[model samples]
Target chain A: DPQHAARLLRALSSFRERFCDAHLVEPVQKNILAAASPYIRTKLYKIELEGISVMVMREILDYIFSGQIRLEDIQDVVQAADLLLLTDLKTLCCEFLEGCIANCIGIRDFALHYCLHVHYLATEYLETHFRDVXXXXXXXXXXXXXXXXXXXXXXXXXXXXXXXXXXXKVHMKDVMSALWVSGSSYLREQMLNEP
Target chain B: SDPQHAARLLRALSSFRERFCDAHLVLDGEEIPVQKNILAAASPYIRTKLYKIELEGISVMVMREILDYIFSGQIRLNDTIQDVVQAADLLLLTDLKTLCCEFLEGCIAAENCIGIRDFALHYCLHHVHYLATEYLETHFRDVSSTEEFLELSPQKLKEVISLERYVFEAVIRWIAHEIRKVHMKDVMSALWVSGLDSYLREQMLNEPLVREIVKE
Candidate 1:
């Protein structure tokens, strides 16, 4: 059943191309079509994995395509779809899940303070790098800050502090989606496991 | 009355200084140097009067009237300065903090009365926004800790409007005036310049509006 669901999900992923091609279509018309699909239209919603009949999976796809889904709303949607042998849907969810995780790495790195507690900073650095390949991207700005640290050293310390403040603000905003995801999925065991 | 008359005179003195500053000297025997010294000496006096008048917690509108008197040469510059210093000292003796606070507020309000050129609007907006953000960052330590204060809800917007009604109106009026001063050609040039973010200068040159404006 799970294998059947996975095959169906793979078939559904093909719709992504159509969606991209028609990207300029007004969002309302897209929502109307997504709502009308048989997979999404069932009253007694059930996932017949072997047979492409998963209402929950269909609804999740509709939500994603509509742009109404926020990063925080993804965990519950993934967990429900994953329960009914919707392996294809689960796999698609996983891609966005990883995107969420990458986002959190940004937020966590931004919140760390280096001077007062080097050990805590070191721990955060290790965890962030361990999480994903792109964690290294964040380090480029950190390195730039260190190289220019001398400019902040003397009477120009105020100017340097101002520069650091600006960099920190930008980095924090970049990772906001990840932080939202963490908040959404961190509470429930099923969602946690699914996540 | 003497202070009022003095303010009028100082304003006249400043105009005279502006003229002197712009004058062309053909020979060394001219009275220009004497005029320059008089203008320079007169400035401190006017500044002192301004300090006094502002210290008395006079409304900015009233101060503007005094400024108008100075500008129109109705008040003697040196006498206005003496009166202003006397008024300022009296206010300082009563309540220095309130006096200073009101004086600063008046000065800030007065800035709006200074006619800003249309070409300078972008520069002014950039500087003002920078200053506002800088002030928020500095005075409100730890933005996260002040989360409750950070949220500017509709009610907060209303409160801000109430407090800064004069400032808001002044800025809007200034912007509207400046917009009227911009020519059709100026608008085209601005649009083209802004387009440089995406369009190449050569491609922009091909635009009919740009070409026409450039020729003009």
Candidate 2:
């Protein structure tokens, strides 16, 4: 919301002075912008090289200001830190991830997806010391059934991510007859227009 | 086996303070140093604000406990759960938020139950909703007549009255006080289980919009 905060993140002329000579700003001096408007730099800056979302970046900034990070938010914070090019924050996430069981009703589901990122600290610590993430007999069969739905949500389905809206149409059609609602039943077949 | 992991990591974070503490937090007025990356990782707003150097509006003791938990995987609720709870809210540290809530649940007493009920219902927190309801249901006559009940916002009063077991007399008493802006729908629904259909309002049944609903 505040453009001032976003605009301040720039590699200044002194940055070039320290990192490279001012004349060497561009060795290949294309210099082809015959006449660019004031809009161009603002436009380029909006497109931060990593493409970090401003809302996510804004939260990161506010959190740093407050200096209070708790376990509940670590996972989203991890993803945003990586996106913001604050690499140290990324490492900080990994450090906390090491004790990842520190959540309540915790991302028990996330633990499964986390093993997908096996290098993921949660699964690594969970499996390394506990042998199974569900080492104690806590009726992990529910986790297995959870995995079944997740499996059918089905990574092997292999649909390109950008095609999800269309994929939802197919999914809605497949489940429509079983939907059991008289209103939904009539609309279910029409739901699959391949639209 | 995990015995020292938190303490070990915490000590590492603490050493070489002058040279390496990359950031500081100014709470209420006191200043606190922090590992910029760690605090930022804990909260993105903290990250952004660290870039700007302007954390405020929390007390030093609460911040110390918060920083302790951030560095080590433990926290102490330490008598000041109220202030700590507000600090947790500002920084978006909901894990500690729950800890504070659990503490307050243990602290709930007859005097504060009305206020606590309003807070829990407003936040929809994890405390056993039944406990609060049971307290109000059993103590209805006492709690309702208290100034605490009088202080409830209209929405909270609406929730309080919705109890299937709410005392009908409490309803009569509540309305008798003549508060502002009584939504008839709320009164009707709450009193529906009681005697909205049968009792004294029998006089005003036909006039669907009774202005002086100060029904006894």
Candidate 3:
């Protein structure tokens, strides 16, 4: 199934490459944003995309063109994807978040804040590894809070996580070390991995 | 050249059309967009066929050249002359066909006259065919020895033989090829054996092939 989606995405990506030069060189006139962004159906003469970084936009375009992207800022990338109504990219971000166990304490809060389906899976991970998640001050959002046990408990509460403004600024790191910690630290996750 | 790249690009285009197409071609009151790029690119590649299916016989090089001519109103009709003529004719490219006719007229030689004549006739380039035929008749002696002249069918040989009936030597040479020898009686009948000069008549009377045909 990934192969089918990958093949199609690869093709779409190459098609983007074919015309990307011509598209970029031309001055942006009253171009239809609807062409690239489905969220804006009506053609506007000119539109502004504020609060999105150039590097994040570059990553999004890279994904749009080649189905390949370096998630240097997963939060920003997923937010941009949400703004552009790219559900697929957002889902990829959610998958990335769910893969890191130590990060699930933060991701559960983040997913809950966004009302994403990854919230359920992240909550399941947090519930299974409550002791480890509570002991580890590694999860970025929980590290900011005074009590790890209170932060892990608040991760399951939609109202508490959603209302907390500090949770919005915490970035989820998608690193090999974090992923290795995810596997090595959780017997439950390791069992799931083997089974 | 790269099939993997082509596959990738095709899939990319498919995805772009499904989700992101901004333009459309209104065909018969239906606004469709997905296949626009395909038609836009491949249509030019296959433009000759789209305009006229009769271009099936034309080579891609010739078609491309003619297409360039159609678009730019300019083309250098050089080495691929015959195919250009054929492409021009089938495409009903009257101006290019005339240009080809002029090119062919200038190309006539003892070696190529027979072929040019046949090619012109096949494409209905009557003026070129006439010029080629005239060129052939004027230089029949030189062209008769050519393999092109030897390969003419019986009916075509009859037509060619009738044009220079007095040149019985040329007819003899044409029919001398093993397969053509069978058409000897039919082809020889076109020659004026009775009207030949005294020495020529003597030569024909002694010739067994001519004698047998004349006996009836």
Candidate 4:
């Protein structure tokens, strides 16, 4: 019965609240130690987790007792799970990351940094979908093309020293314009590429 | 995976397949096998266990229904609601009993309120008992005329009356339904004649049953 399970789940939720109310001062403190470990015994009234956001921490407790979660902040949830040694939650996050059209770059970095087996899966996704993943900026280059050519460096001086098309007056004038344009384009592309 | 989620789900599967089933309940000389942990999860009465336990007061059909609720966490209660309530109470299945109470609450009326109120009071379902009691009290005139009310045991009928003119009349009506000397003495004991109207007090002396009791 859905209603049966609902009543039990609601009963468990009430139990969780009452259990925490009896034992702790903060919901986060209750969530961390209650779900994280039963071995926790301390004299401290407060404990702090620097990496976990308030939202993710809240969701962690909701998932722990409720047996459900949404994967919105998967990365932070995974990190928080790892920090708390919630291997099951971490594995779930890893599986979710691997199964979706996820940000595999950040996922790969997160996996590798966390020493997860999903590191390989994220790497595989990144390698297979590299073109789609990385943004190559044609619009930024076109925008940069209209900027003043003077502010750019050694390209202007280097093109002048080379002096390739030194033949006649019109050719010299055309070459002068060509050198300036070349210097401008290459400088923009260099800042796009080289330095 | 949540340990409890997987543990309970897999435990139910393991039970139906008769794998790792450690407990056997003997209901009326028939053995119904179940996993001890799963049974104990819902019922504390089953926690104090031996390998083979003999259970009583529950029919095999109702016990099977309780087992389904234990393993699957649901029940379809209908015709055998009273039997299920009795079985659930025997097994200390409070949730199932509560469901029965809710079902029985909706079933209260003038026709069945006497029977239902008695059933609820027997099962210690105080809320349902109270609701049924309230219904019978409000509709006492209509409810007392019911065959259910007529069929009530002298003790049960005695508990149904109170200090009012209508109640004194209800007692006489019940006695006249089945005029037994013992029923007359038992039911009249619950009536308070001081609370009766002056006309009713005069009317009671003219009654043959009252004359017999007064002579006794």
- Highest TM-score: give the candidate number: 4
Please write out the lDDT profile of model 3 over residues A1-195, one tens digit for every residue.
123334433433434422221222111211122334555434332344657876676666666545446564476887787787766668778777777646556676667667785777777776666555544544424444434344435422322232222344333242234344744233334347643
Q: Which scores greater on lDDT, model 1 or model 3?
A: 3
Which sections of candidate 4 miss by over 4 Å?
Answer: A1-3, A6-103, A106-195, B1-16, B153-155, B163-165, B181-216
Off by over 4 Å in 3: A1-35, A138-195, B1-216
Q: Which sequence of candidate numbers ranks them by lDDT, best first?
A: 4, 3, 2, 1
Model 3 earns a TM-score of 0.38
User: Of the candidates shown, which would achieve the greatest DockQ relative to the real structure?
Assistant: 4
Best-matching candidate per lDDT = 4
Give a tens-digit lDDT track for model 2, residues B1-216.
222322332344444344345556766666666655456545546745632255667778778888776655456875476677777777877666767777777766665677666666656654634466678778776786777776556677767767752344444445433454455456566656555346544533434224445342
lDDT of model 4 at position B202: 60
> Which of 1 and 2 is the better model by lDDT?
2
For model 3 chain B, give the 10-residue run with minimal summed lDDT.
B46-55
Q: Which stretches of candidate 1 lie over 4 Å from their true place?
A: A1-58, A61-72, A102-195, B1-216
Give the per-residue lDDT of model 4 (tens digit) for B89-109: 887888888888889999998
Alpha carbon lDDT of residue A155, candidate 4? Answer: 40
TM-score of 4: 0.53
Clashing pairs for model 4 are none
Question: All predictions: root-mean-square deviation over Cα?
Answer: 38.2, 26.7, 15.8, 13.3
Worst 10 residues of 2 chain B by lDDT: B1-10
Interface RMSD of 3: 13.5
Chain A TM-scores, candidates in order:
0.24, 0.33, 0.55, 0.53
Positional deviation of B70 in candidate 1, in angstroms?
Answer: 94
The better candidate by TM-score, 1 or 3, is: 3
